[model samples]
Target: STNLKDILADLIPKEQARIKTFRQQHGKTVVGQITVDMMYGGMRGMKGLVYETSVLDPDEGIRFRGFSIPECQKLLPKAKGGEEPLPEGLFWLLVTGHIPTEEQVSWLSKEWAKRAALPSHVVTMLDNFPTNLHPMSQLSAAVTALNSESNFARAYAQGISRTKYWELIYEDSMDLIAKLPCVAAKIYRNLYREGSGIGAIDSNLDWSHNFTNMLGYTDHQFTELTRLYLTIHSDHEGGNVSAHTSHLVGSALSDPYLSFAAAMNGLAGPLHGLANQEVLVWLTQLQKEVGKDVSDEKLRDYIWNTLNSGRVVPGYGHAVLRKTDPRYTCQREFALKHLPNDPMFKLVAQLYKIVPNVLLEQGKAKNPWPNVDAHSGVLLQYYGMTEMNYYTVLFGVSRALGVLAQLIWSRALGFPLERPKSMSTEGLMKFVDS
Candidate 1:
C-alpha cells in the first residue's frame, strides 16, 4: 500500500481504459466552441484540456478530483494533532484521487525524506548564483539544469516505448518534489539569510514540516500554516498558466524537470503566481497610507481613490472564480484562528467585508472578491517570511504536484502534443462572410 509506483502501476491500466472508453465513445463530441474573443482573451472559455487532478468552479473554487478544500481538510490525513491537512496528503489525493490513509501519508513522508538530496552540480549552481538574480529565476535555472537527473529523458534517450513514459516521469516527479524543499530553502537561505544553516532533512518529519524546518522556522503553528498554504496552492485546475504551461511542455514529450521549469517560468509572470507578491505591496501601501484602525468609510474612500487613480485592487478579482475564492476563505479561517490580535489580518478581514459590495456597486469588475493571493502574503508576513520575490518560488514548488501528476496521467491517457491554430486577419474576415 505504501509503494506509490506500484500503486500507480496498478491504477494506470484501469485509468487508461477509462479514458480510452470515454474518448472512443465521445471522440467527436463538440465539448467547446472556439470564438474570436476566446482566441484574443487567452482561451478563457476553451475546453481544450483534459486535466484529471483538479477542476476550478466559478462558485465552488478548486476541487481536487472532486474533494473541496474543506472536504480535504476534513478527510485528508493530517500531521499528529495538526488541524491542517499535510501537503503530502493533497499530493496523494491529486495523483490517486483518493484520500490517503495516515499510514500511506507516513510512507510518502518517509519516501520524500529519503529522496530529498540535491546533486553536487545543482548545489554548486545554486550557490554560485548572483544575489542580484531573482529567486524565481534561480529556481527555474536550477530545475532546468537538474534535467541532467531526469529519468524520463534518460529513458527516452534509450528509446523507451511510449507506454513506459509515465513510469519514468513518475520517478522524476517524486525526485523533483522530494528535493523542492531543499532547493527552495537553499535559495531562501542563500538570498536572504546568507549566513545560516537549516540542517538536514529529518526522515521523521512530514513534507511541510520538513520544509518549514528547512526554512528556519520552528514555530509549530507556522508548520501548520505551511501545510495549509502548500496544499491550497498546489493545484488550480489545468487551465491556469502554470498547469497549462506544464501540460503544454509535457505534451512535447519533455521530461518533467524541463516541463516543470517551463511552468515555473509561466508562474513567474505578473498575471500568474507573481500576483501573490503584489497583494503584499498593496496591503503594505494601504497600511502606510491609512492608520491601522481606520473606519470602513476611510478604507472605502481610500479604495475609491485607488480606483479613481486607475489602479485595481491587487488581489480582488480572479479570471475564473466568481465568488470569494475558497482558497481565500480557507486562509481567512487560518488567520482568524491564529492571529486574533493581528492588525493586518483585521485589515484583510475588513477589506473582505467591504471590497465585494464596492466592486459590485462600481460595476467595473467581474468577480470583485478576494482571491488566494490577497491573503497569502499577509499570512507569510505574520509568520516572518516576508521576501516577496520568493513567494512565487513557493508557489512553483507546491504547483509541481498538480502539473506533474497531470503530466503522468497525460502520458497514461495518451494526450497528444498541444497544437492550436492561430487565425489570420483574412481568416477572421472569412469567419463571418461564410
Candidate 2:
C-alpha cells in the first residue's frame, strides 16, 4: 500500500504548478456577477472560492472529484460482502482524485483505526456534559477540546515556515478525522444511552462500521446503512455552510479541530444540517395529522396549507440542484432494498410522489424536488436511531471527511486568508445616486 504522505507529496507540486499557471493566465477573468440580492441573500451564486474536492451541479448534484453519487457507488471500493462504498475510499477519492485500490483503502482504514483513540482528557470532558445537552453541542465541545493536541497549533507556535505548513495541517487533519468517530459516537452513547457504557472500536472494521459499533448497533444492515450514509453526506461542494465555514476558519491558520468544530456549528443551523431533523419532525406531524395512508389529494392540500401558512416545506427545495437530489434518490433506493415497509419511509415515498408536482403547480419553489435531507431521517428512524437532534451530529461526522480533506489541500496549495469586500447601505446608496 502506498503511504498517503508520499502520494500527496508527489501530487501537490503538480497541482500547485497547474494552479499557478491557471492564475497567471486567468486570475482576473470574471466568472459571474455579484448582485445586491446575492450579497444580501448569503452570496448564493457567487463563485469566489477554489474548492478542489467536489463540485455541485445544478442538474447532476454533487460530484466528488467529478464522480457522481451513483458513479461513486459503483466505482469506489466497497467492504467485503458489502455493496456500499467505504468512506475511506471516498476520502481518498476526494483528496487525490483517483479511486483507491482495495489494499490502499484497507491500509487507510487501519491507519485511521490506529489513530482513532481520543485523548483521555477529551473523554473526561465529554463525560462532564449533561445527558440532555444537544449532541451537536457535545460534539463541538469535544472537538474544540481536541485543539489542545493540534500539530498545526504547536507547529505554528514554534514559527514553522510557510512551506512546511501543510505537513502539520495534514497531520492535524488526519488525526481529527481519525478521532471524530470515537468522539461523535461517545457523545451518542453518553447522551442517549446514559453512559450505559459504549463499546470499544473494532480495529478490524472500516471507519463507518466502527462508528456504528461504538454506538452499540450490531446489525450488519445498520453498518452498511452507516457506510452509505456517511459516504454520501461527506461532501456537497464547498459553498454549503459547513464546508465554507471550515475553509474560512482554516484559512486563518486555525487547526483542523477548531476549524471543523466551527464548521459543525454552522451545520447546526435550521436551514443546513438541521433540515433533516426538521424533515423527520414535519413527517411525524404529517403522520399524526393525516395518518400514514394519506391520499394524494389530502397530502397536496396539506402541503399547500403548510405553504399558505408561510412556512417553507422542509426538505423540499434547494439553493442549487434543479432536479431531484441524487443523494435523495440513492437513499430512496436503499430504502427500497432494506426497509420498504417502514411507515416513515412509506410516508416519504408518498411525499416523493406528491410534493414536487404540487410545488410545480404552486409555482413558488425554484427547485421543488426533495434533497438529501428528505430521506436520511426516514432511514435512520427506520433503524431506530430516532433521536432527531443527534442527526446533525452524524452529518457533522461525515462532513469532516470532506471539509478536513479540503483544509489540508487549502494549506498545501497555500490559499490565503479569506476576506471579501463589503459595503454599507449608505455607500451603496451613494453609488446608486452617482
Candidate 3:
C-alpha cells in the first residue's frame, strides 16, 4: 500500500551498509582539501556534506541522482498530456536513487492528496498576520506553527528508537510537502486576492495541477510552466544557503516542518531565491527606459550604461557555473514553445545572446551567462502573476521537495550534529606561520 515508504525503508538499510563499508575500508580518504580562502569565502568549493539528492558541476550544471535536467525532462513521468515532468517524479528520484514508474508517481499523487490538510490553528495564525507581512515570513511562520503536526517531533518527545528516526521524519516530510501548495495558495489568495478561499486540493490532479488550481489559474500552460519550474528548482546540491540551512537544522534533530521553515527564511534573501524577482525588476526598468520595441543596438547601449555605472547585471552570472545554467536553458526552451511572441521574453532571449558576449568583451565577469533567475519571473509575469514580492514563496514551495527529501535520508543514515570549527584571523595567522 505504501510504495514510497516501503521502497525507502528497504533502500535505506542497503545504502547504510554500502556507506558503512565504504567508510570502513576508506576512513582516512580525503575528498576535497579546504584552503584558507575557501573558509573565508563561505566555504565555496568545499566538500563536507554527503547530499544524496543532486550534485552541481561547474561547466555542466546540476544532475539529480546522476540525471541532467534534460534527461529528467525525457525520463520522468509527466501529467497526462503534459509536456513537463511533474515535481512528484523529481522528488521520488531524489528520495530514492532510481527513477519511478508512472504508476508509482500516480500513487504518490493520490497519497499526497490524501494527506493534504492543515491544522485549524495554523490557518488562524496565517489569517492573523498583517497584510504587509512578507509572504516568505508568513510562509516561514506558518510552517513553524505547523510543527505542531510533526510526527517526528511528537515521537521524539516520547523517546523513539534512534535507528528508526527516518521512519517518522519520512512521514512528516511527505505530509509537509503535500500540504505546502495549500499553504502557499492560502498566502497568495490572502495577500494578493484579498483573503479569498483557495479551493480544495483535487485528488485526481498532480501536484502542480492542484497548485495552479488553488492559486486560481485556468491556463493549463501555466501549470505546465509550474511543473517545469518546480522540477528544475527542486534541488541544487545541498550547499546552497536554503538547502544547507535545512540540512544543518535537520541535523540538530529538528522536525521536517521546522527545518524547512529555516530553509525558507534563507530563500527570502535577495541573493538567493529573490533574485527571480530582481531580474524582473531590472528588466522592467530596462523596458521602461528603452520601450518595448527597442533595437538590439539600444539594448547593448543600456547594458553598457549599467556596467559603466559599476552595477553588476542582475541575472547574468553565477558563483559556481562557468557556462549557461541548464535551469535557464530549460526555461528558455519552455518560453520558446509556449510564448514565443512575449515582449519581455523576447528581451530576455535577446539578453541571453547579448549579455554573455558583452561580458566576454568587458573581461571582468567570469561566468558571463544567464542563470535560473534570468527567466523565471518572465515566465510567471506572462501568466499575469505580477505580485513580485510573492515570487520567492513559489520558489519556497518547490524547494520543500528537495530539502525535505534529504532530511529523511539525513535521519536514515545517522548523520551527527553538524559542527565546524571557527578560527579568528590571529589564530589562523599563527597556525600558518607555525
Candidate 4:
C-alpha cells in the first residue's frame, strides 16, 4: 500500500526544513569557479558556477540524506547476498525516510514489473526513427512523446486543484519510472538487435538488474553491479545538470516526463553527464596514439603530455569535488570485485594515478581527481556496451529514479514555481552609463 498523499503529508515538512538548512549553510558560498575551454586558452576560472548539491570527502562520495557512498552501500537495502542496495530500495529510503527491507524491495520490483509494458504505438514510434539518429536524440524524442500522455497535461486541461496537482505528478512519476527500462532497452534493441528481438521484463530481478536483463544480457550476475551504479548516480544533489533542469522545468508545473526530458537534454552537454563519453573517447584516442601495450611507467609522461597539451584530463577535475569522487571510488571497488584484471580497469587505475600528477604540474587544476565519469565508462565497457555514445542512456535510467524522487518532494512541499532572476549584458551597460 504505497500512498502518495500520506507520503507527501509527512515529507513536506522534512524537505522544507532540509531546504532551509541547506540555504542557511551553503547557499551563498563560492563553491567552485568554472573554467571555459577555448582555442588559444580560455577564461581562467570563470566565477559563479552554481554549487552542486552533492560532493565528496574521504568519508563518503555522495552526501544525500547525509549518507556517504560506503554508508549508503551498507545501510541502504540490498538483496540478501546482493552486492549493493537496489535502486528501488534507495528510492524507498529517499522518499519515505526509512531504509526498506528486502521484502519492500521485492514489492517495488513487482510493482515496477506490472507497470513496465510500453504502448505498441511507442514501439512503432521508435521503429520509425532512422538507424543513424543518435541514441540520446531518440531517447529525448521518446520522452517528448511521453509528454503528450502527461498526467499534468490532462489535469490542467480539465482543471484541477493545487492539492490534486501533486497527485497527477505522482502518477506520472511512477508511470515514467516503471516504463523507463522499456524505453532504454528499446534503444539497445534497436541498435543491436537489428529490429528483431525486444526482450521481456524479468520481475524476479531487482529494478536495475532487470534493466540489464531486458537489454539482452540476461546470463550474468549484474544484480550487484547495477545496484552500485544506480545508487551512485541516483542524485548528484539539487543543482547538477539533470537535477537542476528537472527543478527548473518543474517550477512551471511541467509534467514529470517533460521535465525529466529537459534534464536529459542538460545531461547531454559535455560539461555535464556527457563527460563520461568524452572520457572513453579521450582514453581510446590516447591509447591509440601512445601505441598498444604502453607501459604504466610511461603513464607519467603521457599524462603530462595530455595536460601540457591543454586538455582538462577527461573524467578528472570536477567543478565541486574537493577530493576524488566517491562514486569513482565505489566503481573502483566494484571493478576490483568483478573485473580487476580487465585491461580497461587497469587503464582506469593507471589513469587515476596519472591524472593527479598531471593536474599538479598543470598549475591551474584546483582538484585533479577522477570524478564519477572516470570510472563509469570502464565498468560499462566491461559489460560490452562498446559505443560511448550510448553511455548516457545508462545514466538516464538511474537518473530517472533520483530526479523523480526529488520531484515528488518538490510537489509534496508545495514549493512555488522556480523563477530565478536573470541579468542582461545590456543591463550591465546601463548601470555603467548611470
Candidate 5:
C-alpha cells in the first residue's frame, strides 16, 4: 500500500544536502546511542536533529531554509502593520518555496477559521478532567479523546486497505490543526480564567491573530509578539524530544493524536519544552539570592558562584548549535526593541556573556550557548504572558505545522517501525565480562 518513491520525493534532495553539510561540519564528532537519561536529562555531545529546512547553529541561530530569523523578518512578507513576518506566512515559504503575499496569508486565515470546528463533546472532555490534573496531563487526555475520530482506527476496524493511509493522514492533519485552538483555549479557561471563555471566530485575522482573538485579547500591542513567538518556536529540526518522539512513535503507524500525545509527554518534562518555565524560576531565584540590584561585574561573579555551586545553568547550554542560539538572539533583539534595560533582562544579558565562557573553561558543554527557551520567557513575562505553564502550549500550536509536515514525509518514505536496539545493564556487564 505504501509506495516509497512517491512519498519521500520532497525530502530526497533537501535531506541529502542537509546530511552532506552535516558531515562536512560535524562528521568528525562521534555520537553514542541515545538513552532515556541522556534524552530526558540532556544529550551532552550528540548532534542535532537534521531535516530539510535548516540546521540550528547553536551559536549562529536558526536559518529557516537558510534564512535567519531577522532575515525572514526583513525578506518575508509581513502582516498589515509592517511588523515582523508572521509564522503562518513563513510556513508558506518553508512549505512552498515562496513568500506568501498578504492576500495569501489572509486566505490561510480564512481556511483555518472555516475548518476550526471542535465538537461540543471535545469541549466537554476538558470539563471532565479534574482540576487537580497538571495542564499537560489534561492536554494529553484531551488529545487522546480526539483520537476517537481518527480514520485509521475506523478504517482498520472496517478492513480498509493499507493504501488509504494517505487519506487518513490528510484527514487527521486537518482535523488536529482545526481543533488545537479550541482545545488550548479550553485549557486556559479550565486553569486560569472562568470555566468558559471564547466562542466562535471572527474570520478576519491570521492564525496567531485569530488565536489572540479567541484568548479574548485584541490588544494588538502584543499581537505581533504572539505572532513572532509562534513563528520562531514552530519547529526545530526533527530530533528534539517533541518532534522526534512524535515521528518515532508515528512511524509505528500510530495516529496523529496518539503520536502527538507521545511527543507531548516528552515535552512535559522539566528538561524539555517545560524548561522555559524553569528558566524563569531560576532567574527569579537568582534575583532573590542577590538581594539587591547588581552590576555586570557582580553578575559575572555570581554566575561563577552559581555554576561552581554545582547545578546546571537553566538557559545556557545546548546539545547542538555550537554558537549563539538564534532563538536567543531573536528574543534579545526583541528585548532591545521592546523591553530594554528592564534590569532582569540586563541580568539575562550578563549570563549570555558569562555562560559560554564558563562552559568553554570546563571544555564540557557541547554547545556553550543558550537556547530559544533561554531568553523567550523573560521577554514574554515582560510583556505579561506569565502563565508559564501555558507557554509551551503556544509552542505546541506552532509546532503542529512542523511535526505534521514531517509525518507526511515519514509516511511517504515508508520509514518503518522505529524499534532501536538496546543493551540492558546486565547485558552490558556480561559482554564486558566475556
Candidate 6:
C-alpha cells in the first residue's frame, strides 16, 4: 500500500544510522590494498567505491542486492502474460532492497507512463538534430537538454538547503527514468525509422514493453525480449564506466540529468558498451569468411587466427566474471526458446561452445567465458532490430535504472565528492622505491 518515495523515506534513517555505526566502529579497516598495478592498470581491482544496488562476484556473476539473476527472474514481478521480470520490479528491489508486489509494480508502470511525455521544446530539439547523428550522441544530448527542466537544478538555483538535496534528486531521477524510453525511442525513430514518430505512451504497458512499442516493435515475443534485456542490462555492480561515471558526476551534486548524460557518453565507448556491436560485426565477418556450414574445426582455426592477428575475440572474456555471465546464459536461453534455428543465434551457440576452450588452449585468458556482450547483439538481430551501432543506446537507457537509483542514495547518504589522489610515473617510482 505504500508508494516508493514513502517507503524510502521510512527506511533511509535506519540505513543511515546503520552506516554511521558501522563507519564509526570500523572506519579505518582496510578492505583492499592499492598496488602500483592497481594505480597504473586503470585502478583495476581497487575497491574504492561503494555501490549498494548490486555486487558482482568473479565466479558467481552479478547479484542485485544479494539476489542472483535467476533469483530475480523467479522473484521479481512480471508483466501480463510475460515470463521475464519487469524492469520496474527490479528497480524497486534495487532502490528498496525488497521485492515489489504486482500491485506496486503495476502502480510504477503507470507512474512512469504518466511522466513519460516529453516537454514540447525537448521533442522539437530532438527533431532538429541531423538524422545522421549517432543515436548515443542524440541520447546524451536529449538527456542533457532535459536538464533545463530539472527540479534539482531549479532548487539549487533557489538556494535550497543541502539537507533537502536528496528530495529533489529523487524527483529528478524518477522523472529522468520515466522519460528515457521516450527519448531513446525518438532517437531510434528519427535515425532508422525516418521520423515515423514514436508511439504514444501506453498506460496499460510496463516500462520495457512500452519502450518496445514506442520503437515500433509489436511482436509480443519482442516485448518479452525487451523486458529481459532491460532487466539484465540495468546494473552491473556500478564499477563499470557508465555507472561509475554517473556516480562520480553525481558526487559533485550535479543534477541527475547531467550525471546520467555524462554516463551515456562513457557508455558510447568502444571498450565498454560498444562490445555488443563489435561482437555482431565480428560474427558477420566470420560468417562471410567461413560460409554457413561452420565446422568446429574451422571455427577453432578462425578463433586462433583472430587471436594471432592481435585482435582479442570480442565478448569472450570478462574483467570480473570467471564463469559464464548469467546475463549471457539468460539470453541464450531466450534464443533457444524462440530462435534456436536462426543462423546468428546458432553461430552464437557455436561460439559459446568453442570460444572458451579455444581461449583456454591459447593459455593467455584469465577468464574465457562468454560475457553479457557475447549474445546480446545476436538476440537483437534475431528480433529484426539489427542497427548494431544503436545498440549502446539501449544499454544506456537500461543503465539509467541502476545509476540513477544509486544517485538518489548517494545524495540521501551524503556520500562525499569522489576525489582520489593521483601520482605521476616518477612519483609512483619514488614511492615504490621508498
State each candidate's clash count. Answer: 0, 0, 0, 0, 5, 0
Better of 4 and 6 by lDDT: 6
Which window of ten consecutive residues has the lowest lDDT sum in model 4? 34-43
**Using lDDT as the measure, which candidate wins?**
3
Model 2 Cα shift for residue 44 (angstroms): 3.2
Candidate 2 residue-wise lDDT at 373: 84
lDDT of candidate 6 over 318-418, digit per residue (tens): 66678898999999999998998999888889988898998888888888998888889988887889888789998888899998888989998889999
Estimate, for each residue in 1-434, the C-alpha lDDT of model 5 and write its tens digit.
12222333454457557666987999888766664465444554455443554456544677676677777777766678747667666766565445667676666666667777777787888877776777877777788888888887677677865544655665676578767777887887778776877767767767776777677665675777877787788777776788889888887888888888788888887677777888899998988887547776776677777778887888777676777776678778877887778877887887887778878997877778887878877877776678888887778877877777667556644456776546676675576665
- Report how far off residue 232 is in candidate 5 (Å): 1.3
| Per-candidate local distance difference test | 0.87, 0.87, 0.90, 0.74, 0.72, 0.89
lDDT of 5 at 61: 73
After superposition on all C-alphas, the RMSD of every candidate to the true structure, in Å, is 1.9, 1.9, 1.7, 4.5, 5.4, 1.8
Predicted candidate 3 versus true structure: per-residue lDDT over 125-234, tens digit per residue = 88888997999999999999999898889889999899999999989999998999999999999898898899888799899999999999999999999999999989
Which regions of candidate 2 fall more than 4 Å away from where they truly are? 304-311, 431-434
Model 1 TM-score on a 0 to 1 scale: 0.95
Query: Model 5, poorest ten-residue lDDT window?
Result: 1-10
Error of 5 at 283 (Å): 1.2
* Residue 391 accuracy (lDDT) in model 4: 83
Best-to-worst lDDT order? 3, 6, 2, 1, 4, 5
lDDT per residue as tens, model 2, 239-331: 889999999999999999999989988998877777787788888888999987788899889988988888887888866688898889989
Q: What root-mean-square deviation over C-alphas does model 4 reach?
A: 4.5
* Candidate 1 RMSD to the real structure: 1.9
